[PDB]
Scaffold this active site. Structure first.
Site, mmCIF file in Angstrom:
data_model
loop_
_atom_site.group_PDB
_atom_site.id
_atom_site.type_symbol
_atom_site.label_atom_id
_atom_site.label_comp_id
_atom_site.label_asym_id
_atom_site.label_seq_id
_atom_site.Cartn_x
_atom_site.Cartn_y
_atom_site.Cartn_z
ATOM 1 N N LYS A 17 0.919 -1.085 0.001
ATOM 2 C CA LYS A 17 -0.241 0.211 -0.086
ATOM 3 C C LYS A 17 0.765 1.200 0.155
ATOM 4 O O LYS A 17 0.919 2.098 -0.827
ATOM 5 C CB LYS A 17 -0.825 -0.105 1.271
ATOM 6 C CG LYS A 17 -2.491 0.431 1.036
ATOM 7 C CD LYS A 17 -3.220 -0.355 2.112
ATOM 8 C CE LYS A 17 -4.781 -0.136 1.896
ATOM 9 N NZ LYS A 17 -5.537 -1.430 2.065
ATOM 10 N N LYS A 36 13.298 0.077 1.286
ATOM 11 C CA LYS A 36 11.580 0.335 1.063
ATOM 12 C C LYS A 36 11.412 1.884 1.024
ATOM 13 O O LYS A 36 11.855 2.507 1.834
ATOM 14 C CB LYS A 36 10.869 -0.236 2.407
ATOM 15 C CG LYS A 36 9.428 -0.038 2.408
ATOM 16 C CD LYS A 36 8.863 -0.776 3.685
ATOM 17 C CE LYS A 36 7.567 -0.318 4.169
ATOM 18 N NZ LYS A 36 6.950 -1.107 5.148
ATOM 19 N N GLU A 85 17.140 -5.696 5.591
ATOM 20 C CA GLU A 85 17.630 -6.921 5.288
ATOM 21 C C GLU A 85 16.750 -7.517 3.998
ATOM 22 O O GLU A 85 15.765 -7.011 3.928
ATOM 23 C CB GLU A 85 17.490 -7.824 6.337
ATOM 24 C CG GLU A 85 17.510 -9.192 6.324
ATOM 25 C CD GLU A 85 17.491 -10.037 7.458
ATOM 26 O OE1 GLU A 85 16.968 -9.517 8.536
ATOM 27 O OE2 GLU A 85 17.456 -11.295 7.394
ATOM 28 N N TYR A 86 17.505 -7.957 2.905
ATOM 29 C CA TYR A 86 16.829 -8.493 1.853
ATOM 30 C C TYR A 86 16.769 -10.018 2.091
ATOM 31 O O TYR A 86 17.500 -10.580 2.598
ATOM 32 C CB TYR A 86 17.790 -8.257 0.767
ATOM 33 C CG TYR A 86 17.629 -9.212 -0.546
ATOM 34 C CD1 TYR A 86 16.243 -9.242 -1.142
ATOM 35 C CD2 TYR A 86 18.466 -9.884 -1.120
ATOM 36 C CE1 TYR A 86 16.191 -10.000 -2.264
ATOM 37 C CE2 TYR A 86 18.481 -10.795 -2.275
ATOM 38 C CZ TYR A 86 17.329 -10.474 -2.620
ATOM 39 O OH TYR A 86 17.242 -11.590 -3.890
ATOM 40 N N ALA A 87 15.495 -10.415 1.881
ATOM 41 C CA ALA A 87 14.847 -11.750 1.900
ATOM 42 C C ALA A 87 15.006 -12.345 0.597
ATOM 43 O O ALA A 87 13.926 -11.791 -0.277
ATOM 44 C CB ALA A 87 13.417 -11.977 2.423
ATOM 45 N N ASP A 130 -0.698 -8.035 12.024
ATOM 46 C CA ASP A 130 -0.781 -7.773 10.687
ATOM 47 C C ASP A 130 0.233 -8.937 10.079
ATOM 48 O O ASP A 130 1.096 -8.713 9.192
ATOM 49 C CB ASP A 130 -0.254 -6.358 10.253
ATOM 50 C CG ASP A 130 -0.409 -5.923 8.738
ATOM 51 O OD1 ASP A 130 -1.564 -6.690 8.078
ATOM 52 O OD2 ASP A 130 0.016 -5.366 7.992
ATOM 53 N N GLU A 134 1.978 -12.080 2.918
ATOM 54 C CA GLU A 134 2.555 -11.072 2.083
ATOM 55 C C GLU A 134 3.593 -10.356 3.159
ATOM 56 O O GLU A 134 4.466 -9.659 2.649
ATOM 57 C CB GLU A 134 1.830 -9.955 1.399
ATOM 58 C CG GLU A 134 1.033 -9.137 2.293
ATOM 59 C CD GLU A 134 -0.010 -8.427 1.847
ATOM 60 O OE1 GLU A 134 -0.774 -9.183 1.165
ATOM 61 O OE2 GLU A 134 -0.218 -7.201 1.915
ATOM 62 N N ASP A 148 7.239 -5.858 7.955
ATOM 63 C CA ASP A 148 6.138 -4.993 7.951
ATOM 64 C C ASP A 148 5.479 -4.751 9.441
ATOM 65 O O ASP A 148 4.374 -5.115 9.533
ATOM 66 C CB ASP A 148 5.133 -5.387 7.171
ATOM 67 C CG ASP A 148 4.116 -4.401 6.688
ATOM 68 O OD1 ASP A 148 4.538 -3.049 7.272
ATOM 69 O OD2 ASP A 148 3.324 -4.641 5.789
#
Ligand SMILES: Nc1ncnc2c1ncn2[C@@H]1O[C@H](COP(=O)(O)OP(=O)(O)OP(=O)(O)O)[C@@H](O)[C@H]1O
Ligand SMILES: [Mg+2]
Length: 259
Positions: A17, A36, A85-87, A130, A134, A148
């Site tokens: 969003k 982000k 951190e990259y997943a 939450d 996703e 998130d």
């Protein structure tokens, strides 16, 4: 500290969003990470600058292997940039789209990872609120990382899909840590079945199904799973198991892995 010129941006990783998340590498060190990117205007209009602070505060300071690290941030005239951190193996959401449903051991494994990560959060009075596929990311070992944290809140405390939210929350009431237990039950069901238990064609129908706790199992869901889910998906928050009862549940212990 950080500036946009410190990074080579590459591939888009996902959109939320608010977040438009990109792959990115830090020039000096060549550290691969995710950026982000949020628009100040949007944040301003929707009025979620609080969620931004919580996300940054909470997530910069936790340390658990099933929780995604936020390393830092900086802003532009026009944007805010979170350094994450990259997943690399993407979302549990894309896993489920690709696979349809998970067997009991992947499901149990993920629930174990979630329940440790949440045990840790709750240890600090942090509730996420939450926990949706996703926002469940996968590290390079395929290990689940919770991301998130914009919805998280210190407990207790008083928009989009309703599927993962408990009665007490969609109805306004006070809630605490037990929100995350209901969501764990919704996730457990969704992993095994491939759709969440209160899914519907409309928000209003969904709302009804959650408040009535109106769900059924397909035949292939086994007795031990039915038992765990039924326990987590109780209307009354106080009746939901603690996270250790989840971790010891004979179906979790039968089906999950240790590190
Ligand atoms: N570190 C990461 N590695 C890989 N992919 C990511 C990462 N962070 C986010 N993504 C992808 O981008 C999507 C959006 O991320 P995110 O959930 O952080 O944004 P949002 O949902 O808009 O956030 P918020 O709830 O703070 O408003 C994710 O669901 C995921 O697909
Ligand atoms: Mg998200």
């Amino acid at each position: 500290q950080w500036a946009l010129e410190d990074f080579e941006i590459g591939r888009p990783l996902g959109k939320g969003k608010f977040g438009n998340v990109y792959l990115a590498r830090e020039k000096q060190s060549k550290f691969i990470l995710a950026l982000k990117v949020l628009f100040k205007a949007q944040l301003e209009k929707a009025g979620v600058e609080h969620q931004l602070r919580r996300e940054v505060e909470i997530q910069s300071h936790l340390r658990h292997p099933n929780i995604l690290r936020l390393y830092g941030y900086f802003h532009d005239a026009t944007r805010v940039y979170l350094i994450l951190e990259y997943a690399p193996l993407g979302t549990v959401y894309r896993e489920l789209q690709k696979l349809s449903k998970f067997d009991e051991q992947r499901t149990a494994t993920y629930i174990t990872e979630l329940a440790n990560a949440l045990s840790y959060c709750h240890s600090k009075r942090v509730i996420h609120r939450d926990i949706k596929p996703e926002n469940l990311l996968l590290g390079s070992a395929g290990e689940l990382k919770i991301a998130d944290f914009g919805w998280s809140v210190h407990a207790p405390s008083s928009c989009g899909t309703l599927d993962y939210l408990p009665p007490e929350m969609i109805e306004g009431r006070m809630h605490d840590e037990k929100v995350d237990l209901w969501s764990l039950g919704v996730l457990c069901y969704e992993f095994l079945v491939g759709k969440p238990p209160f899914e519907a064609n409309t928000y209003q129908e969904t709302y009804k199904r959650i408040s009535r706790v109106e769900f059924t199992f397909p035949d292939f869901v086994t007795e031990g799973a039915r038992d765990l889910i039924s326990r987590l998906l109780k209307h009354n928050p106080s009746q939901r198991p603690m996270l250790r009862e989840v971790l010891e549940h004979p179906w979790i212990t039968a089906n999950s892995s240790k590190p």
